[PDB]
Amino acid sequence: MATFVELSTKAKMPIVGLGTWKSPLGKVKEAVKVAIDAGYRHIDCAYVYQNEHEVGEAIQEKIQEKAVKREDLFIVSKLWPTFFERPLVRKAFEKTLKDLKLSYLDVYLIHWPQGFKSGDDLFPKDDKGNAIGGKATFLDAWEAMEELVDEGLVKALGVSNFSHFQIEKLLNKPGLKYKPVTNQVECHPYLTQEKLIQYCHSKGITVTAYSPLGSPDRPWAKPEDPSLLEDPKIKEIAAKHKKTAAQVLIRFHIQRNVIVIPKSVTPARIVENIQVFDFKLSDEEMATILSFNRNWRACNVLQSSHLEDYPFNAEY
Ligand SMILES: NC(=O)c1ccc[n+]([C@@H]2O[C@H](COP(=O)([O-])OP(=O)(O)OC[C@H]3O[C@@H](n4cnc5c(N)ncnc54)[C@H](OP(=O)(O)O)[C@@H]3O)[C@@H](O)[C@H]2O)c1
Numbered sequence: 464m465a466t467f468v469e470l471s472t473k474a475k476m477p478i479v480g481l482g483t484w485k486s487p488l489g490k491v492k493e494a495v496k497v498a499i500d501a502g503y504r505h506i507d508c509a510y511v512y513q514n515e516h517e518v519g520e521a522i523q524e525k526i527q528e529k530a531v532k533r534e535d536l537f538i539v540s541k542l543w544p545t546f547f548e549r550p551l552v553r554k555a556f557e558k559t560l561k562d563l564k565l566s567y568l569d570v571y572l573i574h575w576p577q578g579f580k581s582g583d584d585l586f587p588k589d590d591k592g593n594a595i596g597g598k599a600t601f602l603d604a605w606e607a608m609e610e611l612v613d614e615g616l617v618k619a620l621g622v623s624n625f626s627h628f629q630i631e632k633l634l635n636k637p638g639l640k641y642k643p644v645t646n647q648v649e650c651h652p653y654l655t656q657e658k659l660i661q662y663c664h665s666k667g668i669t670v671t672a673y674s675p676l677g678s679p680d681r682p683w684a685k686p687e688d689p690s691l692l693e694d695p696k697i698k699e700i701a702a703k704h705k706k707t708a709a710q711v712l713i714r715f716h717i718q719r720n721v722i723v724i725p726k727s728v729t730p731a732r733i734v735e736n737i738q739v740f741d742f743k744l745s746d747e748e749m750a751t752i753l754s755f756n757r758n759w760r761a762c763n764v765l766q767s768s769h770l771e772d773y774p775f776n777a778e779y
Pocket of ligand 1: 481485673674675681692710727736
């Protein structure tokens with residue numbers, strides 16, 4: 464059982480959640496089942512992961528067997544950028560809700576600020592693999608998502624992979640009924656997101672950290688790419704508390720009041736990843752970790768720097 468972070472809607476969002484990116488079918492259902500048993504009350508989902516139907520089976524099992532009540536679960540999913548056109552936001556949202564077997568979501572995020580070519584080709588690209596843009600923007604999608612909140616099919620909306628520039632574009636839209644409650648971005652000691660976090664909090668927006676362990680199993684990894692779990696300075700700090708480097712990397716976010724969503728389908732690691740409320744990193748250990756900032760992204764896979772709202776060019 465965890466601390467939470469309060470949203471501007473006064474809803475309470477569990478500070479540690481289970482990530483499900485790349486969680487295979489046949490493993491993800493058991494993954495969710497172990498996490499809930501382990502005290503995870505927050506599960507992070509997406510249409511684009513193409514496994515929400517199996518996540519929905521697991522959640523439903525545990526509500527059935529009285530292990531957890533819906534009101535105490537905090538379920539998040541994401542709208543993919545080939546569905547920014549208006550009838551498609553509703554259709555994409557309905558498939559997510561149906562696969563998840565839920566009556567409502569706690570938060571619905573814009574997964575990526577750049578519209579891609581509309582439709583169920585989720586990664587439209589040219590011959591060189593560059594993203595094919597669509598004409599609908601994240602503003603068009605937000606307007607459509609706002610309807611879902613009006614209807615009580617979504618408690619709150621948020622953003623993911625937004626720069627402060629694109630949040631400014633959102634917050635400064637005339638006519639906006641709802642603001643985002645969170646901005647979910649990659650964050651870890653190599654990419655500490657200090658300005659963006661300071662920006663989002665100043666605006667009442669929480670931050671959710673994905674890839675907190677450096678997403679080591681990412682298929683596109685180079686052996687030259689730095690590894691956080693094998694980092695001696697991260698390992699020194701883990702040794703001090705007799706915890707794992709992984710436990711240190713998750714706790715780092717908790718002590719910044721940043722929500723963090725480590726992904727696992729391995730039961731022993733799922734449990735390990737939430738045993739982070741019986742120790743504390745010192746201000747000096749925290750400052751050492753923050754010094755490791757390299758401005759290095761493990762996830763920069765969409766070859767899309769050529770379309771309009773690219774988030775990663777900007778300083779923050
Ligand atoms: N908003 C976005 O743009 C976006 C994009 C992608 C993902 N996400 C979300 O963020 C979540 C998590 O981030 P991520 O999947 O990028 O990478 P991550 O959570 O940093 O790392 C996942 C990898 O670390 C392993 N691992 C987990 N716990 C470990 C431990 N205690 N010791 C050693 N290894 C451990 C996992 O292995 P096993 O799984 O084999 O145990 C997996 O290979 C995703 O599941 C997804 O829900 C968001």
